[PDB]
Amino acid sequence: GTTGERPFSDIITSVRYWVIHSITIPALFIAGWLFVSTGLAYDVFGTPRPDSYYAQEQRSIPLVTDRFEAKQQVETFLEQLK
Template identity: 60%
Template sequence: SLFIAGWLFVSTGLAYDVFGSPRPNEYFTESRQGIPLITGRFDSLEQLDEFSRSF
């Protein structure tokens, strides 16, 4: 029963909602086609905020 519960958790998409990860069709949007890489060491929080605003 634990296997079935885990399978339902993943297959229904509830895992994406709980953990806040984007769904496979939301990785690349029309406005953002590049990979969101963190390039700066000291301004990483600003880059993360910028990436999260684009979602």
């Protein structure tokens, strides 16, 4: 009834496991935090910041309306936020 891998219950109660993972887990949590707090997540994914959904006097959605010029359309939208 066992395939040879080490039992989970044995692993997570073991001192060595917690020696490694008390480091690896907060480091991953802190890394993810910095991904957001530095603003990197906005830039990678192209997600508008609270101040860049609309131009100041604008209430029109910058909706993509062309298939093959779509990329250019988004870029034209973005310049109109500066």
